[PDB]
Amino acid sequence: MGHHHHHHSHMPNGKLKCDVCGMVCIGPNVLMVHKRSHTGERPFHCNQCGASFTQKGNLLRHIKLHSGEKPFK
């Protein structure tokens, strides 16, 4: 007549962290409004280019230099 006991208890516990961290900011169209500020009153657009200027003296010689005349520098 012998004796033998049984009680050695072990159980898991705890969990993992997976907290979300990746918030992104957004900006307005700064490119258009800064260009708009640089434009005088009339957008000096080259009708033969589709190019936008705000300087008249640039546009006035630019439309001239479009023809095969005038020295290139």
Query: Which residue shows structure tokens 């003296």?
Result: 57
Q: Does 49 bind Zn ion (CB under 5 A)?
A: yes
Stretch that binds Zn ion, among 20-28, 29-37, 43-51, 52-60 (CB under 5 A): 43-51
- For the chain, strand residue ranges (E) read 44-46, 51-53
Q: Does 65 bind Zn ion (CB under 5 A)?
A: no
Check if the beta carbon of residue 39 is closer than 8 Å to that of residue 31.
Answer: no
Check if the beta carbon of residue 53 is closer than 8 Å to that of residue 46.
Answer: yes
Q: Does 46 bind Zn ion (CB under 5 A)?
A: yes
For the bound state, the minimum distance from the C-beta of residue 54 to Zn ion, rounded and expressed in Å, comes to 15
Q: Does 48 bind Zn ion (CB under 5 A)?
A: yes
- Which residues here bind Zn ion, judged by CB under 5 A? 46, 48-49
